[PDB]
Design an enzyme around this catalytic site. Sequence first.
Site, short mmCIF file in Angstrom:
data_model
loop_
_atom_site.label_atom_id
_atom_site.label_comp_id
_atom_site.label_asym_id
_atom_site.label_seq_id
_atom_site.Cartn_x
_atom_site.Cartn_y
_atom_site.Cartn_z
N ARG F 89 0.69 -0.99 -0.44
CA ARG F 89 -0.24 0.18 -0.32
C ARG F 89 0.56 1.37 0.06
NH1 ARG F 89 -3.78 3.13 2.02
NH2 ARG F 89 -2.42 3.99 3.68
N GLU F 181 -3.64 6.78 9.19
CA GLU F 181 -4.49 6.47 7.72
C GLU F 181 -5.90 6.13 7.95
OE1 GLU F 181 -3.74 2.77 6.48
OE2 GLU F 181 -3.49 2.84 8.10
N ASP F 206 0.06 15.95 6.43
CA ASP F 206 -0.04 17.01 7.86
C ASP F 206 0.34 16.27 9.03
OD1 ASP F 206 -2.61 18.78 6.58
OD2 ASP F 206 -2.80 16.79 5.47
#
Lengths: 237, 237, 237, 237, 237, 237
Positions: F89, F181, F206
Amino acid sequence: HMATPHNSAKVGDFAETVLMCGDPLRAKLIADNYLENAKQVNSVRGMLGFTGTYKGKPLSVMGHGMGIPSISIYAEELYNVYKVKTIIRVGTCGTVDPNVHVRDVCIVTASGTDSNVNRMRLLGHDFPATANFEVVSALVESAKALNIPTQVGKAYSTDIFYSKEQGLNEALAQYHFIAVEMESAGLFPIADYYGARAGCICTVSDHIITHESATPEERQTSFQNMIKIALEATLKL
Amino acid sequence: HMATPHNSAKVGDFAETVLMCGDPLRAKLIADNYLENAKQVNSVRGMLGFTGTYKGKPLSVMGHGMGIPSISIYAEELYNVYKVKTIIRVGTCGTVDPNVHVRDVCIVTASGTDSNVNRMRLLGHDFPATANFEVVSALVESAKALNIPTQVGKAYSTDIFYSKEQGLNEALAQYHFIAVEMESAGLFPIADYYGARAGCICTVSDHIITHESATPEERQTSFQNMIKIALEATLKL
Amino acid sequence: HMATPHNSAKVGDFAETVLMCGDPLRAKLIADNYLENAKQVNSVRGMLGFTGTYKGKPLSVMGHGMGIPSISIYAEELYNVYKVKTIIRVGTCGTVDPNVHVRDVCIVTASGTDSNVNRMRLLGHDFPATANFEVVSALVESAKALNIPTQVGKAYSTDIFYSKEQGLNEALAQYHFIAVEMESAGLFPIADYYGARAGCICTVSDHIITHESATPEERQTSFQNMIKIALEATLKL
Amino acid sequence: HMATPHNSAKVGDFAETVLMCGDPLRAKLIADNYLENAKQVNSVRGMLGFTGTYKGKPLSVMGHGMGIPSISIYAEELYNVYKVKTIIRVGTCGTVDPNVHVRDVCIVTASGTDSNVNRMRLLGHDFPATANFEVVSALVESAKALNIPTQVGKAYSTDIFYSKEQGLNEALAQYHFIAVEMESAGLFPIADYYGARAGCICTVSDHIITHESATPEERQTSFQNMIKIALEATLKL
Amino acid sequence: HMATPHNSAKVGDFAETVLMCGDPLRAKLIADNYLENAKQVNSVRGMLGFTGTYKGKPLSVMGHGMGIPSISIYAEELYNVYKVKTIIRVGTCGTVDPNVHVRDVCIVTASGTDSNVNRMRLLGHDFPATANFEVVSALVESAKALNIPTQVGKAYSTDIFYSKEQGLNEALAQYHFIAVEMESAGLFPIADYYGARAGCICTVSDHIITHESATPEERQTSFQNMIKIALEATLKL
Amino acid sequence: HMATPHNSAKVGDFAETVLMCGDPLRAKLIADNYLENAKQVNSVRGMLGFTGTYKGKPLSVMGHGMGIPSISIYAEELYNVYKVKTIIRVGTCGTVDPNVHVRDVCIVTASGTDSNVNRMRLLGHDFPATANFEVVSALVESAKALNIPTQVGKAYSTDIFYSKEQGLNEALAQYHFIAVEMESAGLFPIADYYGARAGCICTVSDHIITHESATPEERQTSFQNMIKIALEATLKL
């Protein structure tokens, strides 16, 4: 006044790296057979701890008792009071994995548990008890340099040695858990809290599914493999 | 071949009644100073156990280590393999109760916990870890005969000595938990499983809310009271 | 202007000791047949309560309805508004225990549950619903003086009379729960909150595993024994 | 032998539609003031139940006591033994919603809870206690036909009348729960199990956030509204 | 700078009523075949959204992706940033109910789930994901006007399309859940938070127990029926 | 008849190694700018997937949507139907760790979650979602060869992008979670089930605590660094 309620060692008596095993008499065996310049630094509750050198580098070895609450006391103290930077747990384990066999050396990347201690740290959520990557890598690389094959993967730390739980072994096998033991899931989050490092390496004494069991001679061979890997890794850490 | 993975004692080496405390060196102190004819019957993992007599009646005393997983191993083995009938845990505790003070003797009727071990025994429900009524009564009556006041009530067994949990002490105080320790909630359900008996008696070393703390001399005096109560109770059991 | 939303009694109308049962019509039978000078002090929602004397000592008897939420309302009010000091619950129960039989008298030391009410009191943890030791002991001693055998041990309070749960009965039997009912686990923590006392005594109407069942005549005899034990216990409290 | 342990009515004594409220004396008031041809069909435990006609159609009204365990007993029996097809709960409630006020009539579409009873029905998952759409619709249109405004939305059923829980009311308000009561979440899943129908309608007695409270006159007005809505709905069901 | 991290539309580009389905290509098919003057207003992440009119009234259509986390992102943004007032989910579903058959149209009143998202909104308790009654009613009436039979009742929203869970289907069937899908339980509580409205309508493509399945022609037929019901409902909302 | 309900590719159309990201348009950019001889193999639901070679070795790239349920569908299908062996990923993440900064590259060893999906796989216990060690190591060295510094450690996968949870960020920071996430915790146990491998690498867009944020130019530099690390890693796997 002792530095902690469970340890008579003075601050500085423990090296920055500590090997730990459940049985304090095995901690003494490690110190006697593998450390030079060894001195005993704790005997509170019989939980023997020692500090010496391995190939010139200061190293400590201490028992941690059985189960998450016990290792949590000792590790919290080692990191907080004794300013330890790295703890490597060494021990034996069962396995359920179909491709793991008795005598295999297992290097733990992360550990599941049936304890509540990690949910309590993360607002009730799933907190993976995760080994430090530099520690895992050092164990893997040491084993390679020593020509010892290893299995690398998940452990499962249970509060109950005498399990009566139906279906647990089958689910652990399905997701390829390689080691079943009782402490690692309590250690790794404490290391996280202190910005420090932890890992675990274990040898397979029993296959929980097939019922294969290591002979005394196999247990000696596996132990000698495991402790040499751990010891050489400390030179890397 | 040891009779269990954690105990070298032969079946019969343990009396039908066993006092247990977390620290094996305190088990040795009890055997040396309060039992006559004490013989060491186990030293595996340094977890010293002894069998002697109190006022002529056979009695054993053994360490159990720290935490529910540790006492669970030893108690399961004592009831199952060694055919023990009664285990009385002896120890120190903290208190949060506004009417309990340092030096108080606490006789435990039931124990709460943050462990998952009892939910796992009862399909996820609330399973009260409950002391045997004959044991509690024997302890209460022994203290009355020895002219020692006691507090009788609930304990709370935690997996985490170094608690970071906000609001826990205040809720325990609100519901008049008299003792905070780490093992009794694991012991009582194992006694149930084996159709056997268990209890717990502890002395208060610290008030967790007011921060009062017993001096070493007070801890010795409290210990002497507690152990005399426990020993006399064994004659009734 | 009622003193509580569920009770028209004025403060002082209840004695410091109250017997409670689920059926208000049975509370009336107890008051009529065993209390002297009984006066009805509540009839809100049909939940009859009475106050008189038993052998000279003030005593009240009131219904509590069915289930933990119902007894929680009435007990909270009795301890808080009416300044009650001791509540003894009296009733019938089922049993799963292999050595408990229909017609047995059960004195409850602690009660498990499938309710969430006690987890909500103790930050999600295991909070044992525990009977007061002086109450348990008074009931045991009263039965002994009346030559009525008793079983002493754990109850289980369920929210669901018409259970569909597979495996529950077997687990309760394995750990020697002696009584199955619906309220005691809600009563004991409320007594704790108010620094007061509670207990429970029940007679076995049904064996849930063997399916043995008390005849109506046997239920009346068991009830008479149980109520005599409770009334005589109130004199010691 | 009674048809159930809690009801002396014979099969057939209850109509296929039953109104239920917690207070059996209010069930009697409803029968006395709104039913014709009324007969009392149960008085076990004082839980009065009646069967008569409303504008020619057979209708029953019975108390259900306080809390999920209590209504679960009576509703399970009504659907299973008495072959009832529809139960409508009528009662009072609190509100937390900023746009709901004391005296308002609340028609419940679904109910949340702090009980475990519905998790136990659905393998531990979230099981929405959901009112039958035909019942909800019949209540809404009946109110429209009677020119009575209604609030339509979620209720919350708690096991604890004397709540000590911080932050609950604010969360309920944030998600616009319109009614706080103690039973509906237990009723709807039982209706589901029996392939039957249930609903709930309540009048707001208290605003839990603002502390506004209905006067006795306001409670009379709202009760008259609610019961007329419920009675007229039964003719459509 | 986009109005949200997942949507390029400017404030106002969405009508106050939005139909949403999981497949963005199906959203495009709906806009193309049923909306007049449809313009595409979003293509971020391929999640096509469109705004046009249906019979003169502004209406939008947009994909929401698969699963509770995905629809939660899009719906939160639609209500919060785009000031949408009504969202109707349209899709396909499975069924386990014995009285529901492939090609049936299911109008969802409330949705259960194995997700944690709603427990996290309501302090760990049971929060029913409940459709707005005006939306449910509009869908029901639209179907009646179109002479299309409908099933009305509970859905179950799962996080795991490829379920391995034993006993789940049987429990869902016993309590007459009529629809199994993956999103509605996440949608309804977000609507509550913003004081807005949501509903769900789906067509049964598969019977999970009997293994009956819709042909492609039947899936087209049911889709046209379901979408026409949704479209006409928007005119009533 | 499609090979799966969500993918039109035929068996064999996917390479044994697959990079996946949430945004299918980002998958298309990766295939276009980094793969040779790329062919699109899926477009169902707009979830673009592509297959080509990187430096001669077969490699695929595909979107997985947002959230655990979405990636679970696609990953289960890739491992089960398409016989994929390795999924990495690639994405963006937030961070809360005080020692992690915007533009940092994070290599994930294990991921926590507030999802229930892993408890449901392991009888309700803690199951660590753990990356395959060979994958982690391939990513770490690829970065070393490219002279790109990396952070290695735990991620946290949430179901709720728009978090309202107080205290979560503080707890994640305390235990040194480096990435926040929404998917990895769902991927790793599926790889386990199929005896396959998965990993994750993300770049910090961020800082959730400091509110520092990447400029678009910085996001592009970090993305290119991350994607090159992953691409070079695939050659070692």
